[PDB]
Amino acid sequence: TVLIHVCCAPDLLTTIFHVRDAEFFFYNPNIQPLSEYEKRREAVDKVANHFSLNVRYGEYSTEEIRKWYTAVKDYKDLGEGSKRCERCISFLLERTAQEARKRGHESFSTTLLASPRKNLPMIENIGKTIEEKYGVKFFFKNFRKGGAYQEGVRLSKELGIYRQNYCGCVFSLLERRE
């Protein structure tokens, strides 16, 4: 069984075309502000209710956001896709692997593998590094392949799923304004 970190509902929709027996873990203290976290969480809950998915919701709090910010802050000034995102994704995947170990899952993954903007080699390297640390296997898949991304777009539209326009953190929201 696999515990799959969930970044957002659109990428969850792409992912569920391929995976069938999973526990999902919505944990994203990198999403600010709270209103945006809740909007994204509610979209995930809408997908989970529609398809009867098993989703666990992680901690979101001032303390949790401060732990994330500490992990990325020395690279604030670098763009998206830089060492800042390496730190951010490792932070999220480390917590996911910890949860997988605690809940008895032998494997972990992330719906970030389905996101068209993310760097697959970077994510696979992070996942394998965390696998070696925790002893939970990282499951890699080109989750966009088999045309699954466009499959996720179609289901997002039909179900009326919120599709965000910035990665999630305050740095990415500023970079949106340019």
Q: Which residues bind ligand SF4 (CB under 6 A)?
A: 30, 72, 80, 84-85, 88-89, 167-169, 171-172
Which tokens in the block code for residue 61? 């709090």
Using CB under 5 A as the binding rule, whether residue 7 contacts Cl ion is answered as yes
Rg (CA), the chain: 15
Q: Which is nearer to Fe ion, 39 or 133 (CB)?
A: 39
169 belongs to an annotated ligand binding site = no
Helices (H), 7-143: 9-16, 34-51, 62-72, 83-102, 120-134
Using CB under 5 A as the binding rule, whether residue 47 contacts Fe ion is answered as no
85 belongs to an annotated ligand binding site = yes
Q: Which is nearer to ligand SF4, 105 or 110 (CB)?
A: 110
Site track 106-125 with Fe ion (rule: CB under 5 A), x = hit = ---------x----------
Distance between CA 107 and CA 130 in Å, rounded? 11
Dihedral sign for Cα atoms in the order 55, 60, 65, 67: negative
Using CB under 5 A as the binding rule, whether residue 23 contacts Fe ion is answered as no
88 belongs to an annotated ligand binding site = yes
Amino acid at 129: T
Using CB under 5 A as the binding rule, whether residue 8 contacts Cl ion is answered as yes
Burial label for 33, CB within 10 Å (0-12, 13-18, 19+), is exposed
Place of tokens 């993310």: 118
**Which residues does the annotation place in the binding site for [4Fe-4S] cluster?**
7-8, 85, 88
Using CB under 5 A, list all residues that contact Cl ion: 7-8, 115
Which residues line the annotated binding site? 7-8, 85, 88
